[PDB]
Design a protein around this ligand. Sequence first.
Ligand SMILES: C[C@@H]1CN(C(=O)N2C[C@H](CN)C[C@H](C(=O)Nc3ccc(Cl)c(F)c3)C2)C[C@H](C)N1C
Ligand SMILES: *[C@@H]1O[C@H](CO)[C@@H](O)[C@H](O)[C@H]1NC(C)=O
Ligand SMILES: *[C@@H]1O[C@H](CO)[C@@H](O)[C@H](O)[C@H]1NC(C)=O
Ligand SMILES: *[C@@H]1O[C@H](CO)[C@@H](O)[C@H](O)[C@H]1NC(C)=O
Ligand SMILES: *[C@@H]1O[C@H](CO)[C@@H](O)[C@H](O)[C@H]1NC(C)=O
Ligand SMILES: *[C@@H]1O[C@H](CO)[C@@H](O)[C@H](O)[C@H]1NC(C)=O
Ligand SMILES: *[C@@H]1O[C@H](CO)[C@@H](O)[C@H](O)[C@H]1NC(C)=O
Ligand SMILES: *[C@@H]1O[C@H](CO)[C@@H](O)[C@H](O)[C@H]1NC(C)=O
Ligand SMILES: *[C@@H]1O[C@H](CO)[C@@H](O)[C@H](O)[C@H]1NC(C)=O
Ligand SMILES: *[C@@H]1O[C@H](CO)[C@@H](O)[C@H](O)[C@H]1NC(C)=O
Ligand SMILES: *[C@@H]1O[C@H](CO)[C@@H](O)[C@H](O)[C@H]1NC(C)=O
Ligand SMILES: [Cl-]
Length: 341
Amino acid sequence: PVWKDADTTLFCASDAKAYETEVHNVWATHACVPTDPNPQEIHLENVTENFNMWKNNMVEQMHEDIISLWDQSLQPCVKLTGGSVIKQACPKISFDPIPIHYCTPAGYVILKCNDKNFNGTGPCKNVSSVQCTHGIKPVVSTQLLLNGSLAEEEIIIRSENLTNNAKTIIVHLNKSVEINCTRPSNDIRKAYCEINGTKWNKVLKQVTEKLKEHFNNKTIIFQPPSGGDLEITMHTFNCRGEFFYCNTTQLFNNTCIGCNGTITLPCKIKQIINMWQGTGQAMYAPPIDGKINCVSNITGILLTRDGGANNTSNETFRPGGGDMRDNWRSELYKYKVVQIE
Ligand SMILES: C[C@@H]1CN(C(=O)N2C[C@H](CN)C[C@H](C(=O)Nc3ccc(Cl)c(F)c3)C2)C[C@H](C)N1C
Ligand SMILES: *[C@@H]1O[C@H](CO)[C@@H](O)[C@H](O)[C@H]1NC(C)=O
Ligand SMILES: *[C@@H]1O[C@H](CO)[C@@H](O)[C@H](O)[C@H]1NC(C)=O
Ligand SMILES: *[C@@H]1O[C@H](CO)[C@@H](O)[C@H](O)[C@H]1NC(C)=O
Ligand SMILES: *[C@@H]1O[C@H](CO)[C@@H](O)[C@H](O)[C@H]1NC(C)=O
Ligand SMILES: *[C@@H]1O[C@H](CO)[C@@H](O)[C@H](O)[C@H]1NC(C)=O
Ligand SMILES: *[C@@H]1O[C@H](CO)[C@@H](O)[C@H](O)[C@H]1NC(C)=O
Ligand SMILES: *[C@@H]1O[C@H](CO)[C@@H](O)[C@H](O)[C@H]1NC(C)=O
Ligand SMILES: *[C@@H]1O[C@H](CO)[C@@H](O)[C@H](O)[C@H]1NC(C)=O
Ligand SMILES: *[C@@H]1O[C@H](CO)[C@@H](O)[C@H](O)[C@H]1NC(C)=O
Ligand SMILES: *[C@@H]1O[C@H](CO)[C@@H](O)[C@H](O)[C@H]1NC(C)=O
Ligand SMILES: [Cl-]
């Protein structure tokens, strides 16, 4: 037994198929090791460990991991970062995230909270020790979290301080709302995303309930964001290499607390995009000729709350995002790094 809250350089694992041109595949083929063919866990009997997912070095290590991954893979024709115009080649590539496992070196271990109620901060009683996290897809996106794991029971909200406005609010859903995005083959930047309205509005009503639970049963209202760049104000994501910007006004505004129908969302495949790895503009080439389609699972929501609602009857939440650290911190929440002191 015995351990101390210390962080150390981590390594990565994956099932990257060699001789596949998937950029994720070819990054994990040269930067990660083959997955543990026999891993195992040891329930720490009678334990109470304190993970603080909002402050954790695992996520930052993952961050630079995806920064590098994307840097050598998704490479723009032109890159305008600070005072510099980087011109290079931009062949259209293969793109579809694959799970990445994080794995401690000898002397350290990973503490996994198996309490299904776990919100991220605060002590956990079902602790459980593993040398590698689980398989995690590094999906880059704003507002909506896609292709991730879901809460084992109730919908859980995670925050670094609910009270504080700026401190992002993350919503971990307990069931999957599928979203289906397409660019039909022969305007080529016009795209759209189908999302079944009954599903969405029902779960949104479950969220809104729990949201109320954490906030003194105040009036719950989900409005579209209050200014920002497209990235922030539009569900942005990358499908097959293309950057979809989808105008999710319907979801946070149709307020059908019975609506029904299969909602169809407008989208634009953006070329010049404000980056997420760092301040700058990246201009890629036009999309490819053909049916560009991705069907993903909505497994979370990035929320930000309005400030001066102290002396009022309501609390307004607008979808946010932009910090992809929070995206990672949505899956690593149940993981801690311990040095064996
Ligand atoms: C050091 C800063 C730099 N930075 C940033 O400047 N922006 C501003 C820009 C709008 N102004 C939106 C950035 C963003 O999310 N982009 C993005 C791109 C592609 C896809 Cl597919 C996606 F889903 C999202 C976030 C990222 C931030 C975390 N970081 C702290
Ligand atoms: C604690 O979590 C582990 C992981 O699955 C499992 O044994 C069970 O869910 C929990 N154990 C007990 C004794 O409740
Ligand atoms: C998270 O759970 C801990 C312990 O149950 C509690 O003290 C804290 O207020 C919770 N935070 C949120 C944002 O629910
Ligand atoms: C999800 O959690 C909510 C609590 O907000 C609960 O009402 C609902 O039944 C749960 N659904 C599933 C499928 O777990
Ligand atoms: C004033 O607003 C903050 C949110 O920014 C809130 O946490 C605080 O409780 C409010 N003040 C009072 C006295 O409730
Ligand atoms: C949470 O946010 C409120 C709002 O500013 C602040 O007064 C309080 O100190 C914060 N809590 C912590 C533990 O920092
Ligand atoms: C989407 O969610 C369903 C049910 O929650 C699950 O069975 C399926 O594997 C998920 N798809 C992906 C790609 O994760
Ligand atoms: C997704 O949308 C496309 C075009 O509308 C359609 O052909 C396909 O059947 C849809 N699939 C799902 C799972 O919604
Ligand atoms: C999204 O579409 C709505 C119309 O449904 C429009 O009012 C709003 O300005 C659009 N938002 C953005 C960021 O284009
Ligand atoms: C979205 O909200 C705005 C107010 O911010 C309103 O003008 C507009 O009608 C709403 N859109 C829908 C589709 O309800
Ligand atoms: C989510 O996973 C599905 C199945 O692997 C994939 O087709 C889709 O492109 C993924 N979505 C994103 C945004 O990566
Ligand atoms: Cl190993």
